[PDB]
Amino acid sequence: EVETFAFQAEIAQLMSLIINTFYSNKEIFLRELISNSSDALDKIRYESLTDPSKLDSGKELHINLIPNKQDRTLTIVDTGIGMTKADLINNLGTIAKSGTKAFMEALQAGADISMIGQFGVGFYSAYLVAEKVTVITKHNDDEQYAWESSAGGSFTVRTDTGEPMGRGTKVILHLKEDQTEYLEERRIKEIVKKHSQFIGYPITLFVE
Ligand SMILES: CCCCn1c(Cc2cc(OC)ccc2OC)nc2c(N)ncnc21
């Protein structure tokens, strides 16, 4: 059973700006997602120091970038802390509301879309390049879920019956027709080198 939810008005407004503004520097989406994966990995690492059993769902702390020309998708996989149903439906939005208001204020005043990460809302930069985003995620305290949105004001959540991931998040970017450059090995390698070369976990770029 698939449940359908409305974004909060502020978040729907941020998603339209991101979709609608003319802004050519779209590649920054990838460092925003990688950064989000890095924070989640820091989190579970930290939490495991005082509860070693939090890694029973997998000891390896890493990021995989998987392009699939066939599906036209690029997936950012992490084995970080993961997200609960409450995160997905409620808490992330609650937190994102104020980072959105700050981000929006900054833009007038002459900030640009590439600073979105300073405001804790860089996830939504996914919509620079993706027509639809699917997030598969698994937290220790909870079940595996699939979140999805093509923007338009709503998202769905369902329990995910696919391949169990153990622990972590996969962000699956269904790319726009004109953005398949981000499926190319030399392009991804270029962007990681430029914006993500210091991340403190291994990032494996899968080949097609
Ligand atoms: C804002 C920071 C936490 C949420 N989060 C994020 C950002 C985020 C994810 C979303 O998924 C549907 C929605 C909104 C988000 O930011 C507000 N990425 C994560 C990740 N890879 N692993 C764990 N938590 C993550």
From Swiss-Prot:
Residues found modified as N6-acetyllysine: K43, K69
Domain of life: Eukaryota
Disulfides per UniProt: none
Region (Interaction with NR3C1): 1-208
Compartments it resides in: Nucleus; Cytoplasm; Melanosome; Cell membrane
Binding of ATP, residues: N36, D78, K97, F123
Post-translational note: ISGylated.
Result after altering D78A: Impaired ATP-binding. Strong interaction with HIF1A, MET, KEAP1 and RHOBTB2. Loss of interaction with HSF1 and ERBB2. Los of interaction with TSC1
Function of the molecule: Molecular chaperone that promotes the maturation, structural maintenance and proper regulation of specific target proteins involved for instance in cell cycle control and signal transduction. Undergoes a functional cycle that is linked to its ATPase activity which is essential for its chaperone activity. This cycle probably induces conformational changes in the client proteins, thereby causing their activation. Interacts dynamically with various co-chaperones that modulate its substrate recognition, ATPase cycle and chaperone function.
Family label: Belongs to the heat shock protein 90 family.
Assembly notes: Homodimer. Identified in NR3C1/GCR steroid receptor-chaperone complexes formed at least by NR3C1, HSP90AA1 and a variety of proteins containing TPR repeats such as FKBP4, FKBP5, PPID, PPP5C or STIP1. Forms a complex containing HSP90AA1, TSC1 and TSC2; TSC1 is required to recruit TCS2 to the complex. The closed form interacts (via the middle domain and TPR repeat-binding motif) with co-chaperone TSC1 (via C-terminus). Interacts with TOM34. Interacts with TERT; the interaction, together with PTGES3, is required for correct assembly and stabilization of the TERT holoenzyme complex.
Entry remark concerning the domains of this protein: The TPR repeat-binding motif mediates interaction with TPR repeat-containing proteins like the co-chaperone STUB1.
Name used for this protein in its record: Heat shock protein HSP 90-alpha
Gene that produces this protein: HSP90AA1
